[PDB]
Amino acid sequence: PQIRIRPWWFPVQELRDPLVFYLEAWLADELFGPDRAIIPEMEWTSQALLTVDIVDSGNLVEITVFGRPRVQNRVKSMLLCLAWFHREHRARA
Amino acid sequence: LTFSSYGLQWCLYELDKEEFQTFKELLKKKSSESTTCSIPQFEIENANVECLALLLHEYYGASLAWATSISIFENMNLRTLSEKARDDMKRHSPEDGDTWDYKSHVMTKFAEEEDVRPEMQTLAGAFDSDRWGFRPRTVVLHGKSGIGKSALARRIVLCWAQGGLYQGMFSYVFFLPVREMQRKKESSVTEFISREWPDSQAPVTEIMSRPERLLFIIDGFDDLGSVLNNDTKLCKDWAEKQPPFTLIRSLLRKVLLPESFLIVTVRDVGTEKLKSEVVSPRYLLVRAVGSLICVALQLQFNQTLTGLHAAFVFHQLTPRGVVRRCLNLEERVVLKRFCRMAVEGVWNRKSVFDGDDLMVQGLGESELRALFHMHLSLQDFCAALYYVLKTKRSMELKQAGFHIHSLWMKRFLFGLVSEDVRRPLEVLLGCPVPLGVKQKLLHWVSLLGQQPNATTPGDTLDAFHCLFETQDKEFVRLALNSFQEVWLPINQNLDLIASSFCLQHCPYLRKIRVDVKGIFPRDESAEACPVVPLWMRDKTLIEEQWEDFCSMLGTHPHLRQLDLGSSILTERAMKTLCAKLRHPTCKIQTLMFRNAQITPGVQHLWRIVMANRNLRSLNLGGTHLKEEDVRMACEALKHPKCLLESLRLDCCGLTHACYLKISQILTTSPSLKSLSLAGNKVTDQGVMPLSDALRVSQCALQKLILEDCGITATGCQSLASALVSNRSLTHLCLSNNSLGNEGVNLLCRSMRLPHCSLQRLMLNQCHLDTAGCGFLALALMGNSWLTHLSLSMNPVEDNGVKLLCEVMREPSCHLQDLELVKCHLTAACCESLSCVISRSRHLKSLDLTDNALGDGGVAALCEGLKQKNSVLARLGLKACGLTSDCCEALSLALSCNRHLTSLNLVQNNFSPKGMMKLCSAFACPTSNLQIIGLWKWQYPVQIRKLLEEVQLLKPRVVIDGSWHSFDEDDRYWWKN
Amino acid sequence: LFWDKEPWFWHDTLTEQLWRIFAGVSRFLQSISWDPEDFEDAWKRKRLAVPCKLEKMRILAHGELVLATAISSFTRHVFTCGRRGIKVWSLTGQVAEDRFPESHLPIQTPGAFLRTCLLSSNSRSLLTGGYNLASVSVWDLAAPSLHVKEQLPCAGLNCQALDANLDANLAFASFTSGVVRIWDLRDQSVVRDLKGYPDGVKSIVVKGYNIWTGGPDACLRCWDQRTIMKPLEYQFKSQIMSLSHSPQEDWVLLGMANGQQWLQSTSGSQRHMVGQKDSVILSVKFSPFGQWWASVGMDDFLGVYSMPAGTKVFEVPEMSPVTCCDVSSNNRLVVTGSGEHASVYQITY
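^ inputs. structure came back:
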């Protein structure tokens, strides 16, 4: 089992029905950074709680979103767009 | 980089579609003026909000992009979003002996109690400090039911005893189980401390020496919330003796031993109930459904999970080693007892049963063990089974009425009337099982269907989910029959599946709209996803399911109208949708795409209009059309087989050549009998070609709309020549244009001839004046074809209305409808109009809104309508500033009149006496008003019940505050 | 809720039927909608339209007199205030009436109350203060656990109004001793102090470089931070109960406690009537887009008015006198508080 804190403003009713998708480890580290200090600010602005986990192999990394389903799809699209920008940026260099 | 862009996108995702386009235009202008950094225009036009923000950052720069966006926001007159952007930038942009014996005894006790019946790192920090600066005393834990809370607590206390956790903070650990405290009706803190020790005596002075040394680990707070329902005074002193629940409450509230610190383990409902007491806590989250489903699958009805659960349960219930054996009567009785126990557990929101309750039920332990093998899902299914096979009013009803955890029970309940799941039960039991539930369920859904308003989107979606669970064709056909039109958002793939299944069996469907977003798979290019396999990237199941939904849409027999309230369609999506509409079997008349965003695939829309024969209408809007697209539209219209009878282009931003092509197709195409161009920049150079097309005698146009075209006098004279030459057109609307007196005069001159065949013309916001009204009145004399007119939102004073009344007072005029709003009217115009109403014999409507008519004006119109000759049908009053005396006079007139049917009164101040008068007048048998405009809830209860009483007599009367109800469709469909 | 003969949901019927069977013995109310697309309101035949609808959608039970209310829209919560503390609600769930708050904020000190509250325009801080209290506290709402992050010292003073301005990091206060102070959230040191009016100032509003205040003396004064010049006095006939400044244009809206409203413009001394009522107004609030304002009074009525001229669109009745109100930033939701309850309405246009 995994243990996590939850703020006092995110309701507990929304924790039902989460969303998950995987990515490259290096891309995830570049997107969030090794420290992931920005998660609280993104959460406060997006009314949505995130959770980053690293698989055992260290190759694929999972991301999570809670909140209403439309918010989930919105954040997924944003993340995939940013990931594509980073992929092409790496490809150029 | 990404951190700031995220906030910027969230800033630009509050912008409406038109606001988004305006922002893009302003940005394009700024970039064109700029030479330091150039941004391509096609990329700007093709980009969406996320792409827009990312590119704006990429070219300009973080701080500079924020500044530019703030400046443009200010230019658009958007203040609040600007402040939000500034603050989020500020927050996003980076700067530039006895104790040993006690613990050993406790460890033996907990080892014995656990024998009878990773996270350490996080638990160790549960009392540390965060970045804000804070040290928590109370920590609440919650999560799914799989984990054993007592297991966590005992493991934590065991690790504490080992010394690897909180070694330096506290030395005494106390475990308070609620069950034991409830066993004893009377207790005290000193009693518990003495009991926990083996010798039964402890030094009270040493224990109470310091607060830090202590700690309390409550468990299972939710078990007895029934006792906690009682309310009692809290005890300040700790030496007193009180019921256990009061002690627990006062210790949680921190009114007793404030310096000490707590920790609690609880279930979701428990943290719903206890959140109101704990002060400034630090909640946490904890996380056998997968194991249970895997076991059931390995121990094998794939359409639904209710089927799988029923199959597994019936497999368990079958006698071991014997197949197809009817249950004995005692077996059935014990099954019913077990199911009743489970149902009581669900209703009372308790998942724990002590042996005492089991004895009260009476079922044996061995039989119960044989009947069950492994959970909330099982309890819910058992409650469903009970339904298949106390005080007068209790709070457990409303408590379970939150429908936060009873959703599974109802989902299962609907799943058992399926015959494929019913038959195994019948053979296993061997006896018939009549059930009155089906009647109630059918009546429930049918009651949903009968609602006067279009069904709420969420209610409709959940109804689709449940019905799809049922999986019975005749059941769905009987249930869905009630309603006609539906409103159905689509958020998830399972939503698509439910929508596809549940609509094939609706026999009376006419209209439907779908708001689709986020379902369309990421493009294979530029959105490659390592997690998704090859199948997901291309030829995904979502593609097949959307195609099947499209096929169902195409093949419906009674479907006519389709609409898209909002959507982000991909080119592949629109291609797939159009593919299923080229089939001749389709019968849809109307379409709509005004609010959607379908620009990439607009070209695909023309093939269907060229091919399909039953298509009658087509509505576009807000899209962007290129020259090639308009040429394709012309060619498609040029096919001899088309029967399209309406088109509507809007804000497409066309070019002069586009107007030329449109004029040519108008003169050549015989089918097209309408056209609308609102928001296009159609200058006089765009008016002349259309007039030249109109001049020819073959033109088959009958309607025409031109909004915000900004034409001038030259366009007016072009239209005048065309109208004198033409003999086919009937409806024309020129609103929001700065024609002026000269344009009014030119059109009037063209219209004075007796061969003109115009029937409806409206000129709004045209900057008219007294002179224009004089010209129109002059050209109105000696005409009998024009039947409607409207001059709204122009400063036509009393004198202009006086001239129009003088012209209309004649018996030869044939004007029927006349509306004029915001014209700065007064009482004198009211005297003239009362004369007209009393005398005239063809006027059938009138409107006077936002005019300070006042008591004198209403009195004059009342003296007019008192007459028995008048044939006025509907009258419009609003925001005219009325009072009591005028309402009395109006009530008397309505009592006298017999032809007036419609009416309207809102935005006025009626006194209660006046409202009494009005209801009494509406009561009279003589008057027959089939519509009245009023707000019921705006009045005291006395008035509401009075108006309801009036509503009871004459059940045909309708009292709805929002007018435009029961109004003909043409009046508002023509104008747009 | 009360207005209808009985409020009912869609699943309520099925639950009631199943319960009755087990024991052996429009019409359907709707839930609030948050997404902007689902509003789907057709064009009349971000926006500046004047609203044309209202409908109650919940009631909130606090247990004791209610003195101040606030509504956050970025987050859905709501804040009620009483003499013994503050309660935090939520609006996400669907229920006819609420009894289990989201958190309780008590104060333990003999003879210690609260009388006022105020939320930051970013929804990140919450000023609280009252009689016989040590200091004015600020709560940090952005954090995963409520806790005071700062204290504003004040001795032997009672605060009767608060305010803030996040652009320059200034927090303001008004005390019953006719003293208006200032602070700075970076250092928490008094910057200035304005005094000389024992009657005091019941209400203060801050915008730019001016501070408008009014009290029982029936006068409105303007102070400027940059200099130490004397204020500009305006004369009125009755007392002033509350003030609000348009965000768009230059106007100041106030209630005169005799059923009259007046508008004052900073540039020049101009006034004109915009309403008349038989009751006494106890609050007035301005829409986020300055096209309409709400007004809650003492004669059990809630009113909504139109900015350009002051004509009233409609009003709703209630049972008990109201004393507070607050319009969301979305421009959709409006909260009000009467007696021991706090209700929630919705606006559709």
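The interface with chain B takes residues 1-6, 8, 12-13, 15, 21-24, 31, 38, 41-42, 45-46, 60, 69-70, 73-74, 76-78, 80-82, 84-85, 87-88 of chain A (CB under 8 Å). The helical segments of chain A are 25-32, 39-46, 69-92.
thumbs up if we can close this ticket
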